[PDB]
């Protein structure tokens, strides 16, 4: 069948942080398994994000490599859903060559707090039944829905739009009346005769409709910085946004909140692999988490007591004690056998592959011997070997094949020791 851009990646099988409305994790749901401690902790965090009333708050998701700390944060993003800003960035993603490392965090926070507004708009929407223009200009236009018909004498600044956009009888058109931009939607099915074809609009032609629109606080920073700032939003052309411009935009957005004219929508910055921000970057987070427009900061890390970057100092998670005091640490847990098998089952539903219960058994043993992510990769490879064999289902010997072809790290390093002097630099 046809392929999306969004194909089957590592986390893609998670379609939410699976929980009961008691914030209780059932054993496996919404694509994800186990972690009965960390999923409940992420449940409480998901309600703090979703409620938004507290600002400048953080959680550190930590544990052995391959224990879902990136996964539950992907599940958290899916459960939070659209229309509440979530930004995932890697810890190494802030090290710009044009923009300060500190300013890149100042900016990465502001992508993740929205300003939401609702604008009443007058929109015309109908099939154009007939359209005539004379030789200044005057013209007359007729519009139809499935329910009514209308005629309009046009003004000059519509004539210079309907003529400019080559509108013809039998088109379906939507017009923002305040501006005269013609959104042509297609042609009516009866005038498709002699290439999008569509039903005529319903209800009355002129609708007042509420448009609700969400602009990230950074997207207000950028629009204000150049002759046409918004291009630099896409192109990345702008960095070191002047700090007094943000100072004024905070004071402005604060008075819109206090007039009730706009609603700020707090969200998530997910600084994935935060273990390698510099001590300078942590020193920025130490204070930037202490302002009313700060988002909820979720951080992921797989490090023990380690030297924090740009220093000789060692501290837990590779984060200074200074910043670990701001935040709540959720430990993930290393998986048991039943959980490991059940994860491998849901991956096989996402890969869309069958395999025998003994194949899942040896794959679970491999997954316990070689830290899970390796066993997940063997699912893909073994199904491709069966497809080469014209086999319907992955039998144990097709895993034993793939397990010999593709080494895990531990065997690779062992087979590297017996060639230790042939490789360079060790």
Partner 1 sequence: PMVRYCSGAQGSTLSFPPGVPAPTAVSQRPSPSGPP
Partner 2 sequence: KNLVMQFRKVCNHPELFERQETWSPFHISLKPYHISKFIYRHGQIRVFNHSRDRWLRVLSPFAPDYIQRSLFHRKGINEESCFSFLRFIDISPAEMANLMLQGLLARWLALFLSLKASYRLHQLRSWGAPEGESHQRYLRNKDFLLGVNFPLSFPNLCSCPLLKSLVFSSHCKAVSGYSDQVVHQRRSATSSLRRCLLTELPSFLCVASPRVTAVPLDSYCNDRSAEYERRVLKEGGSLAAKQCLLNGAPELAADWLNRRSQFFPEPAGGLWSIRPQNGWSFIRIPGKESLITDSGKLYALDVLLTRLKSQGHR
Partner 3 sequence: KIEEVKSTTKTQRIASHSHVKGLGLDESGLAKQAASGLVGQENAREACGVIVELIKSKKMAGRAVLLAGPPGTGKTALALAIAQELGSKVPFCPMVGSEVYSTEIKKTEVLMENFRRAIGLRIKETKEVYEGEVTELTPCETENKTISHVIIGLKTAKGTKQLKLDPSIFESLQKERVEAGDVIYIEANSGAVKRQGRCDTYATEFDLEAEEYVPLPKGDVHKKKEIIQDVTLHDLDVANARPQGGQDILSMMGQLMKPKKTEITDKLRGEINKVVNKYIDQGIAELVPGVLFVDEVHMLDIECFTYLHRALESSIAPIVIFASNRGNCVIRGTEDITSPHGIPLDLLDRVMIIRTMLYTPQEMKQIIKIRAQTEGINISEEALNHLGEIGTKTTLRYSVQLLTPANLLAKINGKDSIEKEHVEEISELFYDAKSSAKILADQQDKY
Ligand X SMILES: Nc1ncnc2c1ncn2[C@@H]1O[C@H](COP(=O)(O)OP(=O)(O)O)[C@@H](O)[C@H]1O
Is 228 annotated among the ligand-binding residues? no
Q: Which stretch binds ligand X (CB under 6 A): 146-154, 311-319, 354-362, 368-376?
A: 368-376
Distance (Å, whole) CA 312 – CA 388: 53
Identified binder of partner 1 from the candidate list 46, 128, 249, 271, rule CB under 8 A: 128
Query: Per-residue b/e over 250-286, b at no fewer than 16 CB within 10 Å?
Result: beebeeeeeeeebebbbbbbbbbbbbbbbbebbebbe
Site for partner 1 in 185-204 (CB under 8 A): 191, 194
Residues contacting 317, CB < 8 A, separation 6+: 60, 62, 275, 301, 303, 306, 324, 329
| Of 49, 1, 41, 46, nearest in space to 24 by CA | 41
Looking up tokens 């056998």 gives 337
Is residue 407 a contact residue for partner 3 (CB under 8 A)? yes
Measure Cα distances from 379 to 144, 160, 396 in Å. Answer: 57, 61, 11
Is 85 annotated among the ligand-binding residues? no
Determine the 3-state secondary structure of 349 from DSSP. Answer: helix
Is residue 350 a contact residue for partner 2 (CB under 8 A)? no
CB closer to partner 3 out of 207 and 373: 373
The option from partner 2, a second copy, ligand X, none interacting with 163 (CB < 5 to 8 A, set by class) reads partner 2
The option from partner 3, partner 2, partner 1, none interacting with 69 (CB < 5 to 8 A, set by class) reads none
Is residue 302 a contact residue for ligand X (CB under 6 A)? yes
Identified binder of ligand X from the candidate list 70, 106, 188, 364, rule CB under 6 A: 70
User: Strand 206-216 relative to strand 306-307: parallel, antiparallel, unpaired?
Assistant: unpaired
Is residue 347 a contact residue for partner 3 (CB under 8 A)? no
Is residue 169 a contact residue for partner 1 (CB under 8 A)? yes
Is 84 annotated among the ligand-binding residues? no
The option from a second copy, partner 2, partner 1, none interacting with 313 (CB < 5 to 8 A, set by class) reads a second copy
Is residue 392 a contact residue for partner 3 (CB under 8 A)? no
Is residue 4 a contact residue for partner 2 (CB under 8 A)? no
Residue 34 — left, alpha, or beta (φ > 0 → left; ψ -120 to 50 → alpha)?
left
Residues contacting 297, CB < 8 A, separation 6+: 57, 58, 59, 268, 269, 271, 285, 289, 327
φ and ψ of 174, to 5 deg: -115, 130
The option from partner 2, a second copy, ligand X, none interacting with 48 (CB < 5 to 8 A, set by class) reads none
- The distance of closest approach from Cβ of residue 325 to partner 3 in the complex, given in angstroms and rounded to an integer, is 5
Binding mask 237-276 for partner 2 (x = CB under 8 A): -------xx--xx--x---x-xxxxx--------------
Residues contacting 314, CB < 8 A, separation 6+: 305, 306, 307, 308
Residue 190, both tokens = 């009866």
Is residue 9 a contact residue for partner 3 (CB under 8 A)? yes
- The distance of closest approach from Cβ of residue 394 to partner 3 in the complex, given in angstroms and rounded to an integer, is 13
Distance (Å, whole) CA 233 – CA 238: 7
Is 126 annotated among the ligand-binding residues? no
- The distance of closest approach from Cβ of residue 300 to partner 2 in the complex, given in angstroms and rounded to an integer, is 28
- The distance of closest approach from Cβ of residue 139 to partner 2 in the complex, given in angstroms and rounded to an integer, is 10
Indicate the helix (H) or strand (E) that contains 28.
Answer: strand 28-29
Binding mask 260-299 for a second copy (x = CB under 8 A): ----------------------------------------
Indicate the helix (H) or strand (E) that contains 230.
Answer: helix 230-235
Q: Which residues bind partner 1 (CB under 8 A)?
A: 128-135, 138, 167-170, 191, 194
The contact set with a second copy (CB under 8 A) reads 313, 320-322, 424-425
Instruction: Detail the residues annotated as belonging to a binding site for ATP.
Output: 63-70
């Amino acid at each position: 069948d046809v392929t999306r851009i969004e194909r089957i990646g590592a986390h893609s099988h998670i379609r939410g942080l699976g929980l009961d409305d008691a914030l209780e994790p059932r054993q496996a749901s919404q694509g994800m398994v186990g972690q009965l401690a960390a999923r409940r902790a992420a449940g409480v965090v998901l309600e703090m994000i979703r409620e938004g009333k507290i600002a400048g708050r953080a959680v550190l998701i930590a544990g052995q490599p391959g224990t879902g700390k990136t996964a539950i944060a992907m599940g958290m993003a899916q459960a939070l859903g659209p229309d509440t800003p979530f930004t995932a960035i890697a810890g190494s993603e802030i090290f710009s060559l044009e923009m300060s490392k500190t300013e890149a965090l100042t900016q990465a926070f502001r992508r993740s707090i929205g300003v939401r507004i609702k604008e009443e708009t007058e929109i015309i929407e109908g099939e154009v039944v007939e359209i005539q223009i004379d030789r200044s200009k005057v013209g007359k236009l007729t519009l139809k829905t499935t329910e009514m018909e209308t005629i309009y004498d046009l003004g000059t600044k519509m004539i210079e739009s309907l003529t400019k956009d080559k509108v013809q009888a039998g088109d379906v058109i939507t017009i923002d009346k305040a501006t005269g931009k013609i959104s042509k939607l297609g042609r009516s099915f009866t005038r498709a005769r002699d290439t999008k074809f569509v039903q005529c609009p319903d209800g009355e032609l002129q609708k007042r409709k509420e448009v609700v629109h969400t602009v990230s606080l950074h997207e207000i920073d950028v629009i204000n910085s150049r002759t046409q700032g918004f291009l630099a939003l896409f192109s990345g052309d702008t960095g070191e946004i002047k700090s007094e411009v943000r100072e004024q935009i905070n004071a402005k957005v604060a008075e819109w909140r206090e007039e009730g004219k706009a609603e700020i929508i707090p969200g998530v910055l997910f600084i994935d692999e935060v273990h390698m921000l510099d001590i300078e970057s942590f020193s920025f987070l130490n204070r930037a988490l202490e302002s009313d427009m700060a988002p909820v900061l979720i951080m992921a890390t797989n490090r023990g007591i380690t030297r924090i970057r740009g220093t000789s100092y060692q501290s837990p998670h590779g984060i200074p004690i200074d910043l670990l005091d701001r935040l709540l640490i959720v430990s993930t847990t290393p998986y048991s056998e039943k959980d490991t098998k059940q994860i491998l089952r849901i991956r096989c539903e996402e890969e869309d592959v069958e395999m025998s219960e003994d194949a899942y058994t040896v794959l679970t043993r491999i997954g316990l011997e070689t830290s899970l992510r390796y066993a997940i990769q063997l699912i893909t490879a073994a199904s491709l070997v069966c497809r080469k064999r014209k086999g319907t289902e992955v039998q144990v010997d097709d895993i034993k094949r793939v397990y010999s072809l593709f080494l895990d790290e531990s065997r690779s390093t062992q087979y590297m020791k017996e060639y230790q002097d042939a490789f360079l630099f060790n």
